[PDB]
Amino acid sequence: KRTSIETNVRFALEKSFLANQKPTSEEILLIAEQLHMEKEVIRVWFCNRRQKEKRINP
Amino acid sequence: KRTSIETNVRFALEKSFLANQKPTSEEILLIAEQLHMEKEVIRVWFCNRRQKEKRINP
Amino acid sequence: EEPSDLEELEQFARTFKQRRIKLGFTQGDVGLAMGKLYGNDFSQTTISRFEALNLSFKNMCKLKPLLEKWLNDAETMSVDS
Amino acid sequence: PSDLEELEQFARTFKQRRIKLGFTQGDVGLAMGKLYGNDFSQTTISRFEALNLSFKNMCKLKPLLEKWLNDAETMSVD
DNA sequence: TCCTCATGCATATGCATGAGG
DNA sequence: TCCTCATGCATATGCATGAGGA
Ligand SMILES: [Br-]
């Protein structure tokens, strides 16, 4: 069970991370409203991008 | 002994492919010598690059 | 090499992917089932390339009927369960 | 000697040493499970070799991979 | 009731192999 | 090893899970 992002949605979703790396539950919902993804698809994406920022390499 | 292609080496090999898609065994040796690589790695790279060009979706 | 043959390959590739995912099979599950179904096993790599048409037209056309039988058999086992 | 440089070097040398032995990333994950009890996935090994893991998780895996290398590199030595 | 954290399934693909011309 | 052709091992990674702490 996986949901995949087109590509340009990811660029906008990345732009939102660079703007706010830790959004509130409300911001994530509006980010999803602006894009099209489910609200929980976005919650986890911000989790992993935070994880990836906390690594030795990326 | 795995062989990986440097990012900029891949651009150079692509640049030569767009100019000549089917080099001779002698040209392969000169490309490999100029890039300091085994001749078979260049030999195989040009094979795969021809194959992928004959795909419905490269 | 007609364009309707290329559109038949595009359409079926989409139909195979959605139906594989609806039935709950991984690409690797398909590769294994065909070995038991046709004797000749296939790899996760080949299934992936097929669903995306990362193969020659000649290669696509030879695999489509094989993958088609597997799907047809799977679509009738799921309506019976 | 910084300890972060110790992990970098060890991760780099582990990759070259794994490849010289002819082991895939997945084979390491499985060999460790049978040898040390908890198996790991090809994904986890790949991230270790590329330093795509936390400094805390990189430190937890190093000694495990360190023991496995000793056993694998002495397969031929009687 | 969202985060962090360790971890991996599933998929895409770079480099390769081998059968055959 | 020189080509095409069909195919795949091995690897990198996008998306996810779940245990555990605010
Ligand atoms: Br050149």
Author numbering:
A (entry chain F), B (entry chain E): 300 to 357
C (entry chain C): 197 to 277
D (entry chain D): 199 to 276
Quote from the publication.
POU-family transcription factors regulate metazoan gene expression via a bipartite DNA-binding domain consisting of two covalently linked helix-turn-helix subdomains, POUS and POUH. POU factors bind as dimers to DNA half-sites to form complexes with a variable quaternary structure. The POU domain combines two helix-turn-helix motifs, a tetra-helical POU-specific subdomain (POUS) and a triple-helical homeodomain (POUH)7 via a linker.
The cocrystal structure revealed nonequivalence in the subunits of the OCT2 homodimer, consistent with topologic heterogeneity of the POUX subunits. Despite the dyad symmetry in MORE, however, the asymmetric unit consisted of the OCT2 homodimer bound with the full sequence containing the two inverted octamers, in contrast with the monomer/single octamer seen in asymmetric units of the MORE-bound cocrystals of OCT1,14 Oct6,24 and Brn2.25 The resolved portions of the two OCT2 subunits aligned albeit incompletely with each other and are in good general agreement with their counterparts in the OCT1, Oct6, and Brn2 structures. The DNA termini were also nonequivalent, with one terminus in Watson–Crick base pairing but the other frayed. Nevertheless, the trajectory of the DNA in the OCT2/DNA structure fitted the 2-fold crystallographic symmetry in the other MORE-bound structures. For one POUS subdomain, the closest POUH subdomain was the one in the asymmetric unit, although it was also only ∼5 Å farther from an equivalent POUH subdomain in an adjacent unit. In contrast, the other POUS subdomain was located >10 Å closer to a POUH subdomain in an adjacent asymmetric unit. A model based on nearest neighbors would assign one pair of POUX subdomains axially along the DNA within the same asymmetric unit, as in other MORE-bound structures, while placing the other subunit in a cross-link across adjacent asymmetric units. As OCT2 carries the longest linker among POU factors, other combinations not limited by linker length are also possible. The evidence therefore suggested that the OCT2 adopted mixed linker topologies in the OCT2/MORE crystal lattice.
